[PDB]
Amino acid sequence: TIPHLAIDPFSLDFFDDPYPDQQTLRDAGPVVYLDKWNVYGVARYAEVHAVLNDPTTFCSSRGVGLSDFKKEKPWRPPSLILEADPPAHTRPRAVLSKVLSPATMKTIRDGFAAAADAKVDELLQRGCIDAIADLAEAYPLSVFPDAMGLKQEGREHLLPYAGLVFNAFGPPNELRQTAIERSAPHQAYVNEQCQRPNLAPGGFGACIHAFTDTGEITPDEAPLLVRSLLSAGLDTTVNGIGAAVYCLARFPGELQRLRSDPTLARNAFEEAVRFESPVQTFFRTTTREVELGGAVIGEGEKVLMFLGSANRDPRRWSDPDLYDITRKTSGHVGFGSGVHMCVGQLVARLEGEVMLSALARKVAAIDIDGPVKRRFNNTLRGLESLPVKLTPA
Ligand code: HEM
Ligand SMILES: COc1cccc(-c2ccc(C(=O)O)cc2)c1
Ligand SMILES: [Cl-]
């Protein structure tokens, strides 16, 4: 019944150009079996959306990587939010939702916008820059560690730690093995900063610890929830912003539409999240036998969801392979969907909006002017180097 495919979605050849294989995965059927890793796969929009919104059968507490926590030891203590199901998920989720709330965005907006404006003006004085190191990495590094309340010492471990986190959701390939091996110094840095004395009052970390007073989380839960923000809160935005700049560099007509109406910045960023899908894949584990796409999946099976594929499925999207900054993007799964839908989405969108606003108001053209290099990661899609020349407006 179910088609068996040999495609390795975690191979460098797949990362280098995933789109033909993603069509093969969609068109093979609503559910496939990936023989390379002994997992089920769903790559169409409808089934990806259905699985994400069925948490009692497609659970997260057995891990959202390939590893099944019922079978193998997690490489670090489980996340209290990402790797938890309701009801254990609910109060930790509520704390992060409140720490990263609409009201909280008012406190950081002016600084985040000012830093984006200043960065674009700085890059315009240089002309020829790397949109990854000098923009997609530099801007989040300039605002997010500070908004967390992190000390200065040790921040060089943040991106390596996140690279490890996202590689570790993958299969035990070379990317994962290399990431986990000798990772203790990155772990030790992050785990130390999660302790309350190391977090500046008023920042996201200290605010998490302040919620221990309410009964929503205990004091021993707070460091792990700070850890969640230090795991997911930086490298995602690096690849999201890099994706947006790469889109604007490749689609000059859309950069010009954004210039003409900078209030399209928020949706231009959202469209970049759909179009590139910085988070490409993750897993669920079945808690029971379940029919999906006409396949009977047994209990305790891993199911791989192709978020980027769902976001390009022509069954759902018109002209899926076009970047369109006025597209109605609502419903894309680049931030997930359902009970685990990105709790940091307001921070991600704030960063993306204010950077694209600064570009819209200050830049007339973005021209690739050196070799583009891809950055390989088992979960994240993005570039290692994006040399561009910025022409001022
Ligand atoms: C463009 C940037 C980002 C993208 C594309 C993204 C994507 C995602 C996705 C797809 C999920 C769902 C995972 C699942 O269902 O298993 C998720 C969850 C999560 N994200 Fe985001 N993320 C981004 C930025 C951020 C930021 C800035 C933060 C924190 C400041 C953050 C923190 C989290 C956390 C803690 C979760 C777990 C939520 C839960 O399990 O309830 N992410 N993200
Ligand atoms: C499994 O695919 C994703 C996609 C986006 C964010 C994350 C993520 C990683 C770690 C945490 C955490 O440590 O809680 C939370 C979210 C995972
Ligand atoms: Cl850790």
Side-chain angles (χ1 to χ4, degrees):
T1 306
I2 179 170
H4 287 240
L5 286 89
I7 293 168
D8 180 3
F10 305 101
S11 65
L12 302 193
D13 168 69
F14 188 103
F15 299 144
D16 172 82
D17 181 20
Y19 298 113
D21 283 338
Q22 283 176 3
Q23 182 171 1
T24 304
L25 294 162
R26 291 192 297 271
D27 289 359
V31 181
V32 301
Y33 196 78
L34 300 174
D35 289 329
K36 172 64 179 207
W37 298 115
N38 270 296
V39 300
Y40 290 85
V42 289
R44 304 172 184 183
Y45 181 86
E47 286 75 25
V48 170
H49 187 273
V51 169
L52 286 171
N53 282 278
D54 187 9
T56 66
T57 289
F58 299 92
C59 79
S60 293
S61 61
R62 285 168 74 167
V64 295
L66 172 67
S67 185
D68 179 349
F69 290 176
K70 197 167 170 200
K71 299 179 176 195
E72 294 172 287
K73 176 185 338 191
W75 72 274
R76 62 174 186 167
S79 165
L80 304 178
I81 181 181
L82 180 73
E83 294 159 343
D85 301 316
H89 166 264
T90 301
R91 282 192 268 166
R93 168 78 184 205
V95 170
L96 293 187
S97 185
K98 289 168 190 191
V99 165
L100 308 179
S101 67
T104 299
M105 300 302 100
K106 180 102 181 183
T107 72
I108 58 170
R109 172 150 187 122
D110 193 77
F112 272 47
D117 278 23
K119 179 56 70 189
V120 178
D121 278 330
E122 168 190 10
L123 299 173
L124 281 165
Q125 308 315 122
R126 311 181 42 183
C128 282
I129 61 103
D130 189 328
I132 303 312
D134 301 321
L135 193 166
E137 289 179 350
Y139 169 70
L141 280 169
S142 78
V143 291
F144 180 74
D146 282 337
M148 283 299 307
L150 294 179
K151 67 177 74 166
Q152 296 294 330
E153 184 62 60
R155 288 179 181 192
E156 71 272 3
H157 292 275
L158 287 166
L159 284 174
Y161 182 83
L164 153 75
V165 168
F166 283 98
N167 273 321
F169 299 119
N173 60 13
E174 191 162 42
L175 279 168
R176 185 174 195 277
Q177 303 168 22
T178 297
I180 287 172
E181 191 181 77
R182 292 194 172 84
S183 63
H186 304 319
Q187 298 185 49
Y189 160 78
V190 162
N191 292 339
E192 180 62 28
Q193 305 324 306
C194 294
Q195 292 285 330
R196 194 177 199 161
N198 295 313
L199 293 163
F204 298 154
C207 288
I208 291 163
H209 282 271
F211 273 94
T212 63
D213 278 352
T214 75
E216 283 166 287
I217 54 162
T218 65
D220 69 284
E221 290 179 320
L224 290 171
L225 285 165
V226 181
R227 194 191 71 171
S228 290
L229 300 193
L230 298 179
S231 301
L234 185 62
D235 209 6
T236 51
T237 65
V238 170
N239 286 295
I241 293 174
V245 175
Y246 193 33
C247 286
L248 294 168
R250 286 177 292 162
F251 293 87
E254 290 307 278
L255 171 63
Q256 289 160 31
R257 291 212 295 153
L258 172 62
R259 291 180 61 200
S260 71
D261 191 348
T263 72
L264 296 171
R266 211 154 163 100
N267 206 59
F269 180 72
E270 202 76 10
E271 171 70 343
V273 175
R274 177 203 70 85
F275 181 87
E276 279 304 321
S277 292
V279 175
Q280 285 276 295
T281 51
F282 50 77
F283 296 81
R284 301 293 193 249
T285 316
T286 57
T287 67
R288 57 169 57 80
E289 174 179 279
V290 54
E291 182 268 316
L292 184 65
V296 174
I297 301 166
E299 183 274 348
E301 300 272 3
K302 285 282 178 169
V303 186
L304 178 56
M305 287 172 287
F306 290 84
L307 301 184
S309 178
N311 282 338
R312 277 166 180 260
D313 182 1
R315 297 157 183 81
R316 164 62 178 85
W317 308 96
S318 168
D319 300 303
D321 299 336
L322 297 192
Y323 179 69
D324 175 7
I325 73 174
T326 53
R327 186 185 299 274
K328 291 186 183 189
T329 55
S330 69
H332 80 81
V333 293
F335 287 115
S337 182
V339 309
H340 294 272
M341 187 183 177
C342 182
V343 72
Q345 59 189 255
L346 301 189
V347 174
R349 291 180 178 134
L350 168 64
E351 291 183 23
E353 178 203 346
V354 300
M355 176 57 69
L356 293 207
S357 177
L359 295 171
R361 290 177 281 110
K362 298 171 182 295
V363 176
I366 303 169
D367 290 298
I368 294 163
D369 74 328
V372 177
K373 306 200 293 154
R374 179 149 301 283
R375 175 172 293 169
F376 299 122
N377 187 275
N378 279 330
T379 300
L380 298 174
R381 169 170 169 88
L383 295 181
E384 167 66 29
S385 175
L386 179 51
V388 293
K389 172 274 292 141
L390 302 181
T391 297

